[PDB]
C-alpha cells in the first residue's frame with residue numbers, strides 16, 4: 001500500500017466526466033475539473049488538462065497521468081504551506097499518506113484550516129486527533145472515507161485499506 005493505491009481506492013476510476021461527492025464535474029481518479037455547473041466549462045477544462053480535444057472521455061493511461069500530477073500537486077501544497085509542512089515533516093510515511101489524501105480531497109487551504117487537528121497530529125496525540133478530525137464537515141459529508149483516513153492517522157497502519 002502507498003498513497004497512489006490509497007487514493008485509487010478512495011476516489012475510484014471513471015473514464016468519462018462524472019460528478020463527485022460535492023456535485024462537481026470530475027474525471028479519472030478523482031481529478032476535479034471545475035466547480036462550475038457548466039458541463040461545457042468542465043469539458044474545456046478537460047481538453048486543457050489532457051492537451052487534446054476530447055469528447056469528455058479519456059483513456060486509463062491519461063487518467064493515471066492526471067492522477068500522478070494531482071498527487072504531486074497535493075504534496076507541493078503541503079510543502080509550501082507554513083501550517084501543513086511542519087506537520088508533514090513530523091509524520092511517518094503512512095501518516096504522511098493520510099495527510100496527502102486530505103489535501104487531495106479538500107485542497108491546501110481547506111486542510112490548513114484544521115488548525116487544532118494539525119496541532120494534535122504534530123503532538124502525536126493520535127486518539128485525540130482522531131476525535132478532533134471527526135468534528136468536521138469533511139467527516140460528516142464523507143464519513144466512510146474520513147474514517148479510513150482517520151484510522152490511518154490513529155494507528156499508523158494500512159489496516160483500513162487492506163482487504
Ligand SMILES: *SC1=NC(C)(C)N(O)C1(C)C
Pocket residue numbers: 069072073074076
Ligand atoms: S501542482 C499545482 N496545482 C495548481 C494549479 C493549484 N498549481 O498552481 C500548481 C502548484 C502548479
Ligand SMILES: [Cl-]
Pocket residue numbers: 048049050066069
Ligand atoms: Cl494537466
Ligand SMILES: [Cl-]
Pocket residue numbers: 055057
Ligand atoms: Cl466514447
Ligand SMILES: [Cl-]
Pocket residue numbers: 065069
Ligand atoms: Cl505528467
Ligand SMILES: [Cl-]
Pocket residue numbers: 090
Ligand atoms: Cl517526533
Ligand SMILES: [Cl-]
Pocket residue numbers: 128131132135
Ligand atoms: Cl476534540
Ligand SMILES: [K+]
Pocket residue numbers: 010011012020021026029030
Ligand atoms: K471520486
